[PDB]
Symmetry: C2
Subunit: 122 residues, 2 copies
């Protein structure tokens, strides 16, 4: 379950990091090459839009991974919860047996109020 | 004093308003005409900078006038303050005369403690 989902989240962080590094490299290549001749308006404006789009995508990937890590941590407790439930089920069944026993004792004690029945009640 | 300063502030408001109206007219003429051919980069970028500069100047003129109106209102009370001071000065002089009179009475009462001197004291 979470063993693979988390490995994929780590792969995502690796890829969004590489994207950030490359987007930053183009950000700078753009500033240095385009300031040489501002008349190349389409090239500088298109590349700046590209850089902003990548920066947003990187930030979104970070947030998405941050949320999915909370889902993953909830998932990783599956076996601990399963064992807690098995214990709760066994406890419920034992409580039921004790209740049925007490009911039978109550009926026996009222029908035949022997001292032994009072001892069994306690 | 404030009679002219305030007239000048009103003239300023009239002129900054006319500037705002003209800056707005160019803002719109620029957007509508330049979208026809975005390749005229120098014209659109220079005129947008012009519009931003004018918008800032108009806002600053508004704030400056708002402050100067507080100085003007303080200035307009010159005659009311002058008259209050004239009253305070006359009061101070009268208080001094009363104090000197009381001192002389005290000396007369101690030197010759006639009942009339006690009456004058009260």
């Amino acid at each position: 379950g979470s063993e693979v989902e988390i490995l994929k989240a780590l792969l995502e962080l690796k890829k969004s990091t590489a994207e950030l590094k490359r987007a930053t490299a183009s950000l700078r290549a753009i500033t240095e090459e385009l300031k040489k001749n501002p008349s190349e308006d389409a090239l500088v404006e298109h590349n700046r839009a590209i850089v902003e789009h990548n920066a947003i995508i990187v930030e979104n990937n970070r947030i998405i991974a941050a949320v999915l890590m909370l889902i993953v941590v909830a998932v990783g407790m599956t076996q601990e919860i399963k064992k807690a439930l098995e214990e709760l089920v066994a406890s419920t069944a034992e409580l039921k047996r004790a209740t049925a026993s007490l009911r039978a004792i109550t009926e026996e004690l009222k029908k035949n109020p022997s001292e032994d029945a009072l001892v069994e009640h306690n």
